Amino acid sequence: MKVPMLVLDPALPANITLKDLPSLYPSFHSASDIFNVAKPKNPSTNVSVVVFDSTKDVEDAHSGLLKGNSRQTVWRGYLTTDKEVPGLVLMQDLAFLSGFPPTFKETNQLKTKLPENLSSKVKLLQLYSEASVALLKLNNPKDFQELNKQTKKNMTIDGKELTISPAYLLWD
Numbered sequence: 001m002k003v004p005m006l007v008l009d010p011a012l013p014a015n016i017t018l019k020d021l022p023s024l025y026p027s028f029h030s031a032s033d034i035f036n037v038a039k040p041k042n043p044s045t046n047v048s049v050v051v052f053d054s055t056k057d058v059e060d061a062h063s064g065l066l067k068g069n070s071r072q073t074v075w076r077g078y079l080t081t082d083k084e085v086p087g088l089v090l091m092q093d094l095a096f097l098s099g100f101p102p103t104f105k106e107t108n109q110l111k112t113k114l115p116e117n118l119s120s121k122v123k124l125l126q127l128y129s130e131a132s133v134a135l136l137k138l139n140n141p142k143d144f145q146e147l148n149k150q151t152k153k154n155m156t157i158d159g160k161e162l163t164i165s166p167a168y169l170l171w172d
Contacts, residue, residue: 002078002170004058009073011046012036027064030057033125035137040092040169051125076172079135081165088168095136095144099155099162105129115155117147118164135167 006028012021014036022029033051052058062074081096097118104110107127114124118136120143126135138144147164155162 001080001082003080004052004055005077005079006050006052006058006062007075007077007171008047008050009039009045009075010048012048027061030061035125037093078170078172080168080170081133083166083168085168085170088170090148091141091167091169093138093141093144094169095138095167096165097134097136097162098132098165099160100132100134100157101160102132103158104132110134110157113157115157115162117150117154133165 012034016023016034018031018034021031021034028050031050031052034048036046036048039045039047052061065072065074079094095118097114100110104127106129107124110127111124112119114122121140122136122138124134125137128134148166153161155164
């Protein structure tokens with residue numbers, strides 16, 4: 001699998017939303033979501049990440065910065081579900097979820113019915129409206145590393161258990 005995102009090396013401050021994004025980021029105007037994060041290997045630097053509809057707006061959005069210089073950086077990133085890429089590595093703040101029932105066709109629904117172990121220092125920002133797979137963002141990978149290899153009953157919705165799926169990081 002793989003999904004169209006861009007990765008950059010900014011720092012937006014805490015105050016900016018989707019509505020103050022295009023204030024300084026004209027070619028990134030087409031997103032519907034944005035999240036502040038650490039850099040994966042330098043916690044002395046914040047960065048941020050974005051979500052776009054498809055390749056069709058992404059390719060052009062990236063093409064924004066192509067005038068030999070910028071105040072910004074762009075890199076590649078492609079999340080996948082498959083353990084079928086050479087060079088793959090586990091994530092550092094990011095996951096999926098599976099196994100929930102079809103009674104779940106909105107984010108707001110599951111937002112407050114995910115179980116404690118996967119509803120502690122985390123958020124949804126990527127669920128299918130019609131298909132049955134979700135992504136996740138976490139903030140405490142300290143314990144995610146332990147959850148990732150847990151071995152007991154803890155998740156339930158409508159009396160039916162679930163699990164979490166793996167996630168891996170691919171740059172180009």
